[PDB]
UniProtKB/Swiss-Prot annotation:
It comes from the Eukaryota. It comes from Homo sapiens. Its main location: nucleus. This is E3 ubiquitin-protein ligase Mdm2. The chain holds residues 1 to 118 of 491 of the full protein. Interacts with p53/TP53, TP73/p73, RBL5 and RP11. Binds specifically to RNA. Can interact with RB1, E1A-associated protein EP300 and the E2F1 transcription factor. Forms a ternary complex with p53/TP53 and WWOX. Interacts with CDKN2AIP, RFWD3, USP7, PYHIN1, and RBBP6. Interacts with ARRB1 and ARRB2. Interacts with PSMA3. Found in a trimeric complex with MDM2, MDM4 and USP2. Interacts with USP2 (via N-terminus and C-terminus). Interacts with MDM4. Part of a complex with MDM2, DAXX, RASSF1 and USP7. Part of a complex with DAXX, MDM2 and USP7. Interacts directly with DAXX and USP7. The lineage of its organism: Eukaryota, Metazoa, Chordata, Craniata, Vertebrata.
């Protein structure tokens, strides 16, 4: 993927997008799990976003030598920090939809304090 700058309306569908990590960002703030994930590669923040975690979690997978050896999409993670994410012996990063949707198991998004008007 290097000739992709505006996509192609020929045998390539409309858009190569899918998964909430840029279009649906969220100023993510998880518990020690995605930060032991990203802060490892190089990250270092009090919070993150699904966009940072997007390309960054992409980093840690491809890195730390946990990936397959066919097309770098069957990334085996036995006893790995990537494992703390879910816990698979292998996961398909190629399908970022299912891979990141199982990343966020329960729930975790931006907080943004609010007020009950009269309080």
């Amino acid at each position: 993927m290097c000739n992709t700058n505006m996509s192609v309306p020929t045998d390539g569908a409309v858009t190569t997008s899918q998964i909430p990590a840029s279009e649906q960002e969220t100023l993510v703030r998880p518990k020690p799990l995605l930060l032991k994930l990203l802060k490892s590669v190089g990250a270092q923040k009090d919070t993150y976003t699904m966009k940072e975690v997007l390309f960054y979690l992409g980093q840690y997978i491809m890195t730390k030598r946990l990936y397959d050896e066919k097309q770098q999409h069957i990334v085996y993670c036995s006893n790995d920090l990537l494992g703390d994410l879910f816990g698979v012996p292998s996961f398909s990063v190629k399908e970022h939809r299912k891979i990141y949707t199982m990343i966020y198991r329960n729930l975790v998004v931006v907080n943004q304090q609010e007020s009950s008007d009269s309080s």
